[PDB]
Amino acid sequence: SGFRKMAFPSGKVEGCMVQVTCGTTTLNGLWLDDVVYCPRHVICTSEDMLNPNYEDLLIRKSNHNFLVQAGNVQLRVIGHSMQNCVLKLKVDTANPKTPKYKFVRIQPGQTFSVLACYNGSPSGVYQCAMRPNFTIKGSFLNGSCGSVGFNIDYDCVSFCYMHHMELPTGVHAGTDLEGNFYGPFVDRQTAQAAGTDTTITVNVLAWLYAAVINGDRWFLNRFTTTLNDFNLVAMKYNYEPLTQDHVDILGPLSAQTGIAVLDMCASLKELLQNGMNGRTILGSALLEDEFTPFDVVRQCSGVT
Amino acid sequence: SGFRKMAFPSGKVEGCMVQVTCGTTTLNGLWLDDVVYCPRHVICTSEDMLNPNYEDLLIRKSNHNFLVQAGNVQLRVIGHSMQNCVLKLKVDTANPKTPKYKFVRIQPGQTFSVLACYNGSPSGVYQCAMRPNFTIKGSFLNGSCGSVGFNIDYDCVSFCYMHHMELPTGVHAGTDLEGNFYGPFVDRQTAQAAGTDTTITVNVLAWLYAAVINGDRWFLNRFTTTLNDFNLVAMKYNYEPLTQDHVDILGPLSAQTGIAVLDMCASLKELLQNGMNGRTILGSALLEDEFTPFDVVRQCSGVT
Numbered sequence: 001s002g003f004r005k006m007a008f009p010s011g012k013v014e015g016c017m018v019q020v021t022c023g024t025t026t027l028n029g030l031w032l033d034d035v036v037y038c039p040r041h042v043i044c045t046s047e048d049m050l051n052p053n054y055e056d057l058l059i060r061k062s063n064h065n066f067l068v069q070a071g072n073v074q075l076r077v078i079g080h081s082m083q084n085c086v087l088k089l090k091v092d093t094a095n096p097k098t099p100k101y102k103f104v105r106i107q108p109g110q111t112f113s114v115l116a117c118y119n120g121s122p123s124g125v126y127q128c129a130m131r132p133n134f135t136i137k138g139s140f141l142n143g144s145c146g147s148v149g150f151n152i153d154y155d156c157v158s159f160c161y162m163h164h165m166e167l168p169t170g171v172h173a174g175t176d177l178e179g180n181f182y183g184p185f186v187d188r189q190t191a192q193a194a195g196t197d198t199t200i201t202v203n204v205l206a207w208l209y210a211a212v213i214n215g216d217r218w219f220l221n222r223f224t225t226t227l228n229d230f231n232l233v234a235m236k237y238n239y240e241p242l243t244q245d246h247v248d249i250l251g252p253l254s255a256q257t258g259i260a261v262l263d264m265c266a267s268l269k270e271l272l273q274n275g276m277n278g279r280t281i282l283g284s285a286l287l288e289d290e291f292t293p294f295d296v297v298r299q300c301s302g303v304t
Numbered sequence: 305s306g307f308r309k310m311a312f313p314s315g316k317v318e319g320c321m322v323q324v325t326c327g328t329t330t331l332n333g334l335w336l337d338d339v340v341y342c343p344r345h346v347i348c349t350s351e352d353m354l355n356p357n358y359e360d361l362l363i364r365k366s367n368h369n370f371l372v373q374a375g376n377v378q379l380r381v382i383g384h385s386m387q388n389c390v391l392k393l394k395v396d397t398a399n400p401k402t403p404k405y406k407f408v409r410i411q412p413g414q415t416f417s418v419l420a421c422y423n424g425s426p427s428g429v430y431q432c433a434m435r436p437n438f439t440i441k442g443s444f445l446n447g448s449c450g451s452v453g454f455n456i457d458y459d460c461v462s463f464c465y466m467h468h469m470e471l472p473t474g475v476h477a478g479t480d481l482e483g484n485f486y487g488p489f490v491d492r493q494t495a496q497a498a499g500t501d502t503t504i505t506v507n508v509l510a511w512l513y514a515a516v517i518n519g520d521r522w523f524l525n526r527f528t529t530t531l532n533d534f535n536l537v538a539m540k541y542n543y544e545p546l547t548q549d550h551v552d553i554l555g556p557l558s559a560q561t562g563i564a565v566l567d568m569c570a571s572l573k574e575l576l577q578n579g580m581n582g583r584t585i586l587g588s589a590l591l592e593d594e595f596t597p598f599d600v601v602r603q604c605s606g607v608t
Contacts, residue, residue: 001443001444001445001470001474002441002442002443002444002470002474002475002476003443004428004430004432004441004442004443005309005430006420006428006429006430006443007311007428007429007430008428008429009314009315009318009419009426009427009428009429010313010314010315010429011313011314011315011316011318011319011426012315014313014315015315115313116310116606117608118606118608119608121608122313122315122608123313123606123607123608124308124310124311124312124313124603125310125311125312125313125314125429126308126309126310126311128308137306137308137587138306138308139305139306139307139308139310139603140305140306141305141604141605141606143606144606166305166306170305170306170518170519171306172306214474215474275582276589278579280590283441284588284589284590285580285588285589285590286584286588286589299428299443300445301445302420302422302427302445302447302448303427304421304422304423304425304426304427
């Protein structure tokens with residue numbers, strides 16, 4: 001029993017972290033096979049970041065300008081290319097600790113673990129979600145760029161995020177491992193405002209199911225609702241619309257607890273309308289939305 | 305910017321997890337050098353757990369009865385002994401992945417990361433605190449016993465906790481790596497009730513400092529208080545007494561933000577008396593107490 005914001009074990013990813021330096025900028029890189037991936041803004045000076053022309057800035061860079069260090073040993077760079085907003089540095093040595101891996105582009109609402117790194121060294125691991133406005137709420141200081149987000153399926157690491165920047169509001173923006181930013185963000189130090197940070201409804205319902213499984217049941221009421229009725233309330237509270245696909249995804253949790261998805265929606269509707277009244281659910285005084293239905297099943301069944 | 309409940313990178317500990325089986329019971333063990341540490345209740349049947357005589361039960365066990373598997377390979381047990389509530393299984397092979405390590409017994413209020421494991425395999429990592437009633441609020445299912453809690457200082461892992469049991473209230477109890485339980489708990493399936501789960505005041509203040517550093521400042525007021533005045537309010541709200549030692553520990557955070565510790569105490573006093581009024585601090589609607597002043601400094605400075 002008990003339910004925690006749990007991250008994947010980070011060992012497999014720790015073995016891939018390297019330091020990348022270009023000129024006076026040092027950030028992190030991900031070493032998989034004989035390629036090191038890192039944000040292309042490693043080639044920029046803080047000045048260049050105001051209006052960078054990456055192709056032009058890259059022309060002044062040679063392989064020997066990218067210093068890649070794995071632990072305390074230097075890697076030899078034999079090629080470099082830009083793919084969208086990431087640089088791929090070909091090295092002469094395949095990473096011996098390369099795990100089985102995939103590059104995936106996640107959708108908003110999906111969660112992942114972040115291994116925060118500085119100078120190619122892991123500092124901590126925490127669990128995040130891709131917000132509906134394509135930002136993440138991380139914990140990143142200067143030097144953390146190139147830190148990655150990932151999910152693990154037994155022994156295969158699916159990398160989904162690479163840290164690139166902090167918006168002036170303190171939220172974070174980054175790319176998938178193909179260098180495409182999540183959302184409309186750009187690797188430029190300019191006016192970039194995030195949209196509405198709506199609540200991930202399907203995740204809240206999943207977490208309410210986790211609460212029932214773990215004994216916190218005070219919020220269960222005698223009501224039911226419909227998808228259309230619930231969605232009128234969801235719109236009012238800046239919650240994402242609940243679809244039949246979400247109801248289907250919640251099916252295993254509904255089966256395990258015996259609580260119909262629409263009955264849980266009515267409980268959530270009353271929680272939104274009446275508040276928590278000073279009470280807590282799974283140690284939280286707010287409705288938690290950074291657990292997917294898959295995370296709830298995984299944590300409640302002990303998948304390794 | 306941003307502040308997350310962050311766990312230490314778990315790689316160093318993942319390399320130490322093994323599976324221990326005795327009869328029909330399988331749990332986790334920690335393999336450091338040529339010793340595997342595990343809860344002594346591995347020798348019990350669910351029946352034995354009602355009133356176990358561990359010394360007597362252990363007489364019927366030989367080295368060959370403890371099956372230790374590291375990954376998919378079997379370790380040879382050449383000795384076994386009981387130290388308090390843990391078994392030490394001497395194996396013929398030193399763990400090649402043994403990190404630099406120490407065994408430490410933490411005090412209530414101290415935080416640590418837990419690597420939840422099943423069948424010797426890591427399932428997830430999360431951050432915990434030793435509660436003032438010597439329980440922890442973890443996420444542990446059957447099979448998770450022997451999962452460990454730890455802190456890391458650069459390359460040295462200080463193991464502080466080994467999971468042993470869940471109380472009938474859903475909270476967790478375990479030992480240090482010398483086998484001594486935290487608190488009054490015993491490895492017996494009997495009536496064990498936890499005491500008052502008071503709030504770790506020094507940690508709340510540390511987290512309020514983290515909030516100020518990260519821009520969440522609405523709760524800062526025009527007031528100050530004294531240690532004695534604040535402590536009268538702390539007693540009323542089941543908060544731990546704040547001592548001059550705690551004020552001293554908060555010194556670096558007070559210096560960085562320019563907010564005197566007693567002024568932050570007055571802000572906390574008003575938060576306790578008036579509530580949050582539907583507002584949040586660092587994404588939380590309750591006062592968070594599972595970040596120590598050291599964790600706040602570490603996360604705010606990027607220690608690797």
